[PDB]
């Protein structure tokens, strides 16, 4: 059969958490199929259906600065790394569902936060009162799965199919950062009181949610030059939102105001300390082989501190 292979540098470095998928768009589908084959098997999906699914997913990502097809694939690679370093903890259905969830988790993203959609009074804010974009991303995932020749799950039973779509829904909902704070707090408590129990479905859900946040934030876990250039894409979306807030007659919060670039370094410190570090710390406590993500994050916090001290 037809094993996808990569050049030697990619074959070795794709196994590492800090891997950057590179600027050759045309290689990213192949990078994804390689990861499915190694974390799932050559059998998980029919190649022709999987290829057709990947290509319609790509088409449904938009040409925005950060929440684009490259982000999709980047987030899926981080899930691949977590799965490969924790071979025996995940069911075959989770292996399958999680890479698809990550490839799909920001489908048809327009570059604007849930909060901007609510203030603009976007139709999606009326259809989905919370996790507005994330409910949209899951809705777009089901759509594509229902196109002719795109059902990559069609060898599963009614009930395996329902389970896998339910893993994908929860995984995508979990990428709403508003929900991450309480999820991590609960997991911190369950880890520390010793009640964390991976046979408890509602515990597993919490642990997959945190993995989803970890993958989603994974630019903070790269080599500093990747982290730093990705930060420019992130703020290029936020500042456009800032502009659109000003057009609605609303002074945007400082992290979205282009006239306050000054405050970016300090806004990065808050983000690493309030969000990223706590995220990878709890993750590393529950899944110890994910420690390199926490180590790379702390490395990047220390680079932002150097930027503040004018050494960078
Ligand atoms: C590198 C990176 N990856 C992903 C995202 C989503 N962001 N967000 C920023 C900076 N910034 C715009 C931001 N700070 C906070 C925050 C700060 C302190 C406390 C709570 C929340 N939320 N947000 C969206 N940097 C990143
Ligand atoms: Mg998202
Ligand atoms: Zn995302």
How is the chain split into domains, by residue range?
Answer: 27-309
Q: Which of 74, 275, 307 to mutate to test the pocket of ligand 1 (most atoms within 8 A of CB)?
A: 275
Q: Which of 271, 274, 299, 303 to mutate to test the pocket of ligand 1 (most atoms within 8 A of CB)?
A: 271
- Provide the token pair at 304: 């932002």
| Resolution stated for this PDB structure, in Å | 2.0
106 is in an annotated binding site: yes
- Provide the token pair at 270: 């808050």
Rounded distance between C-alpha atoms, residue 196 and residue 188, angstroms: 9
Tell me the helix, strand and coil percentages in the chain, rounded to 5: 70, 0, 30
- Provide the token pair at 123: 């139709």
State the structure-solving technique. Answer: X-ray
Kindly give, in sequence order, each residue whose CB lies less than 8 Å from that of residue 33, ignoring residues fewer than 6 positions away: 4, 47, 50, 51, 54
Kindly give, in sequence order, each residue whose CB lies less than 8 Å from that of residue 139, ignoring residues fewer than 6 positions away: none
Q: 27-309 has which fold?
A: Catalytic domain of cyclic nucleotide phosphodiesterase 4b2b (1.10.1300)
């Amino acid at each position: 059969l037809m094993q996808f292979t990569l050049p030697v540098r990619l074959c070795k470095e794709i196994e590492l958490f800090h891997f950057d998928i590179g600027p050759f768009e045309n290689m990213w589908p192949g990078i994804f199929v390689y990861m499915v084959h190694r974390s799932c098997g050559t059998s998980c999906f029919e190649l022709e259906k999987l290829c057709r699914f990947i290509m319609s997913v790509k088409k449904n990502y938009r040409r925005v600065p950060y929440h684009n097809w490259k982000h999709a694939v980047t987030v899926a690679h981080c899930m691949y790394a977590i799965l490969q370093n924790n071979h025996t903890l995940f069911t075959d259905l989770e292996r399958k569902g999680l890479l698809i969830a990550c490839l799909c988790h920001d489908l048809d993203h327009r570059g604007f936060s849930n909060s901007y959609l609510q203030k603009f009074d976007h139709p999606l804010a009326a259809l989905y009162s919370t996790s507005t974009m994330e409910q949209h991303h899951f809705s777009q995932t089901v759509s594509i799965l229902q196109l002719e020749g795109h059902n990559i799950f069609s060898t599963l039973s009614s009930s395996e199919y329902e389970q896998v779509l339910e893993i994908i829904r929860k995984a995508i909902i979990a990428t709403d950062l508003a929900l991450y704070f309480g999820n991590r707090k609960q997991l911190e408590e369950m880890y520390q009181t010793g009640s964390l129990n991976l046979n408890n479905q509602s515990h597993r859900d919490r642990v997959i949610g945190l993995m989803m946040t970890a993958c989603d934030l994974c630019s903070v876990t790269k080599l500093w030059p990747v982290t730093k250039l990705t930060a420019n894409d992130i703020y290029a979306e936020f500042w456009a939102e800032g502009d659109e807030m000003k057009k609605l007659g609303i002074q945007p919060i400082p992290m979205m105001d282009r006239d306050k670039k000054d405050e970016v370094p300090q806004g990065q410190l808050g983000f690493y300390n309030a969000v990223a570090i706590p995220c990878y710390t709890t993750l590393t406590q529950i899944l110890p082989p994910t420690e390199p993500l926490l180590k790379a994050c702390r490395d990047n916090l220390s680079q932002w501190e150097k930027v503040i001290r004018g050494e960078e």
